[PDB]
Amino acid sequence: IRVFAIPPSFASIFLTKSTKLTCLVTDLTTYDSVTISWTRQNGEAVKTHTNISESHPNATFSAVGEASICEDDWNSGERFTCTVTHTDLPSPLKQTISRPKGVALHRPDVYLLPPAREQLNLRESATITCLVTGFSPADVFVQWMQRGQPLSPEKYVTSAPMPEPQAPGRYFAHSILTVSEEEWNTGETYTCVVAHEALPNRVTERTVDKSTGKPTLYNVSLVM
Amino acid sequence: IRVFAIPPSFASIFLTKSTKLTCLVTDLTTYDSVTISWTRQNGEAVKTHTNISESHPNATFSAVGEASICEDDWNSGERFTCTVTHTDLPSPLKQTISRPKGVALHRPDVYLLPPAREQLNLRESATITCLVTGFSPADVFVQWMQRGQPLSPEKYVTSAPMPEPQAPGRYFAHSILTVSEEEWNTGETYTCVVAHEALPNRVTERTVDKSTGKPTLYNVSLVM
């Protein structure tokens, strides 16, 4: 029996365009009347639970509570009082969380690197790395789209934020995309979109194809 | 009684990151008791109508009722009703506005044209046109960014959307950025950003400089 308070990441709120606070109560006994109400410091939130998780392998139940809350309330700093009520707990427990404040804002520097020539020579799989560095407060959402069409989330993996060596305040993040050689050889202008607080547009785009390496001012070829 | 309910346009919701809805009364007594109330389907109370407009010299009544509302509920299509009653007319006037439904969403196609050679020859100024076409609905926000920071609102002018001739539902929009010729010679990489509903991130980016638009002038062939 434990109660968790989960602040939604900017990765979560940007994906669905909604700040969805979520409270997990884990390892509760499988009893009846599983109800999760909602309050705040004012007391006007209303929503119930949806699709409570089944019994975990350690032989106990669990419940999840999620609600829709506006973006401006999330930016205001109000402590949202997520309350969970159950019969096993003699007293219902409520959780109050809010955004951290006072953190500096540093604009991300999204630089896109083409796959290495040695990797291209092997002709099995080519990897394109999106470098997102020099951004705070180190909460980013990086996704890949092809010709304006988003790709499957399984195709790409985004690394967790890590501290920058030179800059202590700024933290970087990484994401790689695996592509076939024939797709890269033809060139579909793969682009990287990065979402962050510090960006004035809050979204930035950088693209690369096979013809980026050529300076496009001269066309020199070697034929035997 | 005449009340003008101005819906929050996409430019308004995107510039301030907070949707602002205003219903403004028009052409009544210069100053008397008035009650403005935003009403949903549930009839719940709303934020107070701050900054009521002062009486105009031409004896035309005007009251600006602004409030902060849920961003997601506005896009959900549920209708917002401004209830205005006045001492002059006992019957209240109900004005209801919402985001229109039954409208197709078409992804904007952003084409960014370099300045003409004839204009660059006179060297008095350079105009860069940001062409956005095939976007629905009519609302759109266009602003200009130079090397990461936005331009002044006076510097750039965005034309009103007009119906596209080929596609009746789709529309097109224009925005010019007149700059001095010597700035274009430096190739400082002007960037055009646009905001619209249909884009996957709701915003997309295009860039132009002196290097872009230059073909391969030199096919230097080294063949043995």
Added chain:
Amino acid sequence: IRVFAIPPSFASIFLTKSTKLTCLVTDLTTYDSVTISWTRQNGEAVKTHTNISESHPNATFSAVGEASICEDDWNSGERFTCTVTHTDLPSPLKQTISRPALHRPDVYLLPPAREQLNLRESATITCLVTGFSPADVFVQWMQRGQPLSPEKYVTSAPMPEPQAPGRYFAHSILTVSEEEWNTGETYTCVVAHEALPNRVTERTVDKSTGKPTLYNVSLVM
């Protein structure tokens, strides 16, 4: 009421050139005069422990049981037991620990982008390690045979490969100045992994690596 020990990882093995044992006791309340001993699956003697701490208020006995053991004992798979005969429980408790598919890692070095170099405040060289199993790699950076300081370069934790769940990838960067890049430097990235037959691989990139080194085409105003 359990015992936990830190397994020797190939990075830690390669740093000290030997397998070292670290048994940080967890989930056991700190009492006076506790008994902790190192034994194998069969239980012969060990060397004396070193650098143990006092009682820990956080209910986790944060004193390390240090012992240096041969490499063949670790890679043979026979278990190691951190036997902790605690005061509260007369029955001794031990934790069996050992190594748990091997794929040769492929190391590819990506030169810094021109956008990074044009701005000139810094240059980042990325070391992409892919297709290694298990997740035990130590990415280190070499410059003309001189090992760079650990603070310059940082390596992310290995993540499962999207193409193959068995495969893992690790990615590391080196933060240098633009002058250090446009001036001739080797900047070798060396990667050590168990699955490598040589146990060590490295790649080198230069400013002229991108150039074909057949035609030096230049633009002059």
